[PDB]
Amino acid sequence: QDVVLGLYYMTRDCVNAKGEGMVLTGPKEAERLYRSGLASLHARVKVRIT
Amino acid sequence: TEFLKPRLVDIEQVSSTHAKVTLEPLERGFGHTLGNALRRILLSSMPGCAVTEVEIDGVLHEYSTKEGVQEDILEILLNLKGLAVRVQGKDEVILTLNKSGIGPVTAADITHDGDVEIVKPQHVICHLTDENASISMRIKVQRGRGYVPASTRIHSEEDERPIGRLLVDACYSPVERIAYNVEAARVEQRTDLDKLVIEMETNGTIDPEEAIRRAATILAEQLEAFVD
Amino acid sequence: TEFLKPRLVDIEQVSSTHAKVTLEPLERGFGHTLGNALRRILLSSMPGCAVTEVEIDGVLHEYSTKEGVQEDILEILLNLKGLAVRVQGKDEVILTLNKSGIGPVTAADITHDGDVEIVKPQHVICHLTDENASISMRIKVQRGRGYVPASTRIHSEEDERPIGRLLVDACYSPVERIAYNVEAARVEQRTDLDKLVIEMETNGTIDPEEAIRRAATILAEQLEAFVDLR
Amino acid sequence: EIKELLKLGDLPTSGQIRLYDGRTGEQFERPVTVGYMYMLKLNHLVDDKM
Amino acid sequence: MLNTCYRILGLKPTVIFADQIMYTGFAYAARSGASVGIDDMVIPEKKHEII
Numbered sequence: 373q374d375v376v377l378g379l380y381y382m383t384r385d386c387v388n389a390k391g392e393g394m395v396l397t398g399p400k401e402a403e404r405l406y407r408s409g410l411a412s413l414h415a416r417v418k419v420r421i422t
Numbered sequence: 423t424e425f426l427k428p429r430l431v432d433i434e435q436v437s438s439t440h441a442k443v444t445l446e447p448l449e450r451g452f453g454h455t456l457g458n459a460l461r462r463i464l465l466s467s468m469p470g471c472a473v474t475e476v477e478i479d480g481v482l483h484e485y486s487t488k489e490g491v492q493e494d495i496l497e498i499l500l501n502l503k504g505l506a507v508r509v510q511g512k513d514e515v516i517l518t519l520n521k522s523g524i525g526p527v528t529a530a531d532i533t534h535d536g537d538v539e540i541v542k543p544q545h546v547i548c549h550l551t552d553e554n555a556s557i558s559m560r561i562k563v564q565r566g567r568g569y570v571p572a573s574t575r576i577h578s579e580e581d582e583r584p585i586g587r588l589l590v591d592a593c594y595s596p597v598e599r600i601a602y603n604v605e606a607a608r609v610e611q612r613t614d615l616d617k618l619v620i621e622m623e624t625n626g627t628i629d630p631e632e633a634i635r636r637a638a639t640i641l642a643e644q645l646e647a648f649v650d
Numbered sequence: 651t652e653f654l655k656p657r658l659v660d661i662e663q664v665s666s667t668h669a670k671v672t673l674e675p676l677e678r679g680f681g682h683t684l685g686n687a688l689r690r691i692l693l694s695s696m697p698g699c700a701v702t703e704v705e706i707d708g709v710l711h712e713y714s715t716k717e718g719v720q721e722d723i724l725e726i727l728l729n730l731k732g733l734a735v736r737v738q739g740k741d742e743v744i745l746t747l748n749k750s751g752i753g754p755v756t757a758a759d760i761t762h763d764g765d766v767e768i769v770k771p772q773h774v775i776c777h778l779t780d781e782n783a784s785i786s787m788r789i790k791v792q793r794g795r796g797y798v799p800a801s802t803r804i805h806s807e808e809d810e811r812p813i814g815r816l817l818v819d820a821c822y823s824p825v826e827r828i829a830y831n832v833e834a835a836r837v838e839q840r841t842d843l844d845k846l847v848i849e850m851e852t853n854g855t856i857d858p859e860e861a862i863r864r865a866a867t868i869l870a871e872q873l874e875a876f877v878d879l880r
Numbered sequence: 881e882i883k884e885l886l887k888l889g890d891l892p893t894s895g896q897i898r899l900y901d902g903r904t905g906e907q908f909e910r911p912v913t914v915g916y917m918y919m920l921k922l923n924h925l926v927d928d929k930m
Numbered sequence: 931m932l933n934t935c936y937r938i939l940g941l942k943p944t945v946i947f948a949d950q951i952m953y954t955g956f957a958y959a960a961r962s963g964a965s966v967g968i969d970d971m972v973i974p975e976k977k978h979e980i981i
Contacts, residue, residue, distance in 0.1 A: 375955030427872070458683075
């Protein structure tokens with residue numbers, strides 16, 4: 373009942389927090405950002421996938 | 423006082439760039455410290471030489487394009503973020519690249535100053551779909567540390583850049599990713615001890631062993647004041 | 651490089667049983683790495699570690715309250731936790747007690763060592779009820795080592811010790827509570843530089859500048875394992 | 881009553897206070913309900929069970 | 931997810947995968963914060979009027 377609550381919180385897509393619509397070459401600076409304290413985990417922001 | 427300090431056990435390496443690190447044993451309450459702090463140092467203060475501004479013949483702004491070229495601008499831009507460079511004598515080199523033919527545009531084709539090092543000369547940049555297509559460009563590399571976007575830069579830059587002189591996010595810091603892990607170390611009567619297992623994968627330009635060595639080295643350099 | 655050393659200013663001790671310090675200056679750059687590293691060991695290399703143990707050996711068998719004591723065992727020891735002892739010359743001590751006959755059993759009856767300052771002789775210990783009842787025990791006052799309690803101690807200590815010995819949690823003496831504050835140092839230009847201010851709280855019996863010097867020497871000597879040793 | 885009483889304590893009206901972890905010192909995301917409950921031990925102890 | 935994972939991959943990824951997902955969701959869910967408060971249930975404005 374908990375890891376599910378976790379994940380459901382993570383991959384979430386708000387509109388309100390911050391950091392809207394900049395770009396990522398990938399999830400590395402996503403973690404650099406979010407572990408640094410900069411982006412919202414829950415914010416649809418442009419990235420690259422492979 | 424009855425201290426402990428860890429034995430750097432194994433540094434498991436996949437590639438030149440990819441590498442893993444176990445760190446045993448630590449007493450509870452350092453693995454997080456080590457991991458947190460060292461990820462801070464490495465992701466946000468390591469130097470390196472990395473691409474900054476550009477000028478090509480026949481360029482204005484990232485939304486237009488070349489004919490006889492597979493890519494758009496932003497593709498190549500993101501194929502220029504994926505170049506390794508290290509200036510050697512300078513902090514700053516301008517390169518020149520002048521292309522013709524149906525050339526999958528590796529980085530090997532550039533005219534190198536003696537004081538510049540591209541670790542991925544294969545590094546693909548661009549394409550000419552047509553052999554009639556042909557270009558002449560130049561690539562300024564500069565030395566810095568960390569990661570600064572051209573957005574923040576052009577916010578900084580009161581220096582007018584013409585349309586054709588284009589601006590992009592810097593990866594001075596040859597790093598890419600760091601992720602640490604504080605695991606449980608058993609010493610015979612002490613399972614409450616912690617370790618710190620880490621992996622880092624980077625660009626070229628660095629031995630990751632050397633990278634962490636330097637991170638530690640610089641943090642050491644700052645703490646020299648505080649020994650006293 | 652642009653290093654900066656931390657040099658002490660003032661020690662502002664509210665009460666006899668207390669100490670406090672202003673301590674400066676610092677910087678920015680690694681300062682949060684340096685923060686979390688400084689502060690986790692601040693909270694870890696806090697202690698000093700001073701109140702240790704008891705050994706009870708008396709009339710009957712010796713685990714441990716026997717025939718005319720009100721106070722079962724953990725309540726005599728918890729009446730020794732708040733016992734205040736100062737040692738001056740040495741860093742280590744052992745006391746003894748013997749008492750008998752009806753009346754309150756207190757710290758004035760302790761075979762005080764001559765180099766020991768008992769600050770409360772009325773700090774209650776136990777009580778004797780029966781006319782037949784009588785009491786003999788031993789108390790290990792401080793020197794500790796390392797950090798807090800018995801639990802983690804025996805978690806460290808594979809050694810098992812002979813008999814009488816009743817192990818105790820360490821709620822100490824001259825480190826009671828702490829806090830701190832990062833200011834912005836005013837150098838004329840470098841106004842974003844950092845001062846720290848460390849609010850410290852103790853019993854008496856420790857100079858805080860000594861607490862601080864000891865701490866820095868200690869950290870120097872730990873990190874001999876990282877500058878001199880790799 | 882409890883809300884008037886709690887703010888007479890100068891506390892939050894709902895007693896919801898920002899909490900800091902100390903494994904990193906930070907703040908958590910949201911404030912948390914804080915306050916004192918009255919609890920009970922039992923004779924149903926692992927001592928009395930194992 | 932673990933279905934599809936098992937189906938095409940065989941299994942071993944789905945194993946390490948699920949382990950890592952248990953790991954990660956537990957980690958940040960402790961970093962995510964979760965609680966309840968008295969005002970998470972309501973004192974609606976229209977209480978006296980309904981009465």
